[PDB]
Design a protein around this ligand. Structure first.
Ligand SMILES: CN(C)c1cc(F)c2c(=O)n(-c3cccc(-c4cc(Nc5ccc(C(=O)N6CCOCC6)cn5)c(=O)n(C)c4)c3CO)ccc2c1
Length: 263
């Protein structure tokens, strides 16, 4: 529990699932982002109990939760500040003119964070470039892990909803609501595709309904031009029709390190 007297609000960063997020300072020293949770958007009491677990998740490639303010409304969620914003928008800016080694390092940043979450048996459930952030050093960190569980908007949480992450979901999620470690693995492979595609929409010529059909047929995303055969093999391994045949994040990390050494 952070004392709100130790927060200063300085500029708006944008609006997400829970409303406005601001940039500010904590204890007159530390940059933070502060979510102001919009009334009616969150299952608040359930989140407040989970915040304890989520504060114990600490890894250099996870956007750190610093604390919450819950003895007031709106609730605040105070997190690490990531100066370069969302990875999706970052990938889409041609001025960065990334080398493929930089793209692979972004995949490795995310894979490290997800290997850590997997070790804690903790699912993200909405892993995608839009839910990763980039700091002032160009390090990519995974954000908003686990928070999908507290979203009250049915257009986001229902599989048939307009906001559901269809293009990052395996067939067993879309058909059966089967969530597991292996559904985050599937999403990771789509995220690698997004990175190597410089932020294209997965299945860019299909609708959500068509994508669900295409993947139920065994067909997959094509190799982005910037991906080598070895990088494509890694992302494609995340898309096995049988969940238990998909790698763990530990194996993915080893594969990524091998490609960095080879290429
Ligand atoms: C349930 N899931 C999956 C959720 C739940 C959420 F709460 C959110 C959420 O708040 N957001 C969300 C919404 C707003 C902000 C942040 C958000 C933005 C940050 N940083 C920046 C930095 C720079 C800029 C920027 O370039 N500008 C220029 C244009 O004018 C504005 C700022 C934007 N953001 C940041 O550090 N954090 C930690 C969060 C975030 C990320 O947190 C996004 C997805 C999301 C997903």
């Amino acid at each position: 529990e952070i004392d709100p007297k130790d927060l200063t609000f300085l500029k708006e960063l944008g609006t997400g699932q829970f409303g406005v997020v601001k940039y500010g300072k904590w204890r007159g020293q530390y940059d933070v982002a502060i979510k102001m949770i919009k009334e009616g958007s969150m299952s608040e009491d359930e989140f407040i109990e989970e915040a304890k677990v989520m504060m114990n998740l600490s890894h250099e490639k996870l956007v750190q939760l610093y604390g919450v303010c819950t003895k007031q409304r709106p609730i605040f969620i105070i997190t690490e500040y990531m100066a370069n914003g969302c990875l999706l928008n970052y990938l889409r800016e041609a001025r960065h003119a990334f080398q493929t080694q930089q793209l692979l390092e972004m995949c490795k940043d995310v894979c490290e964070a997800m290997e850590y979450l997997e070790s804690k048996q903790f699912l993200h459930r909405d892993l995608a470039a839009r839910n990763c952030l980039v700091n002032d050093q160009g390090v990519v960190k995974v954000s908003d892990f686990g928070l999908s569980r507290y979203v009250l908007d049915d257009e986001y949480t229902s599989s048939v909803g307009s906001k559901f992450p269809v293009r990052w979901s395996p067939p067993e999620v879309l058909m059966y609501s089967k969530f597991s470690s292996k559904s985050d693995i599937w999403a990771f492979g789509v995220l690698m595709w997004e990175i190597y595609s410089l932020g294209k929409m997965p299945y860019e010529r299909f609708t959500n309904s068509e994508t669900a059909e295409h993947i139920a047929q065994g067909l997959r995303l094509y190799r982005p031009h910037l991906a080598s055969a070895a990088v494509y093999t890694i992302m494609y391994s995340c898309w096995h029709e049988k969940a238990d045949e998909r790698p763990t994040f530990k194996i993915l990390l080893s594969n990524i390190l091998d490609v960095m050494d080879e290429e």
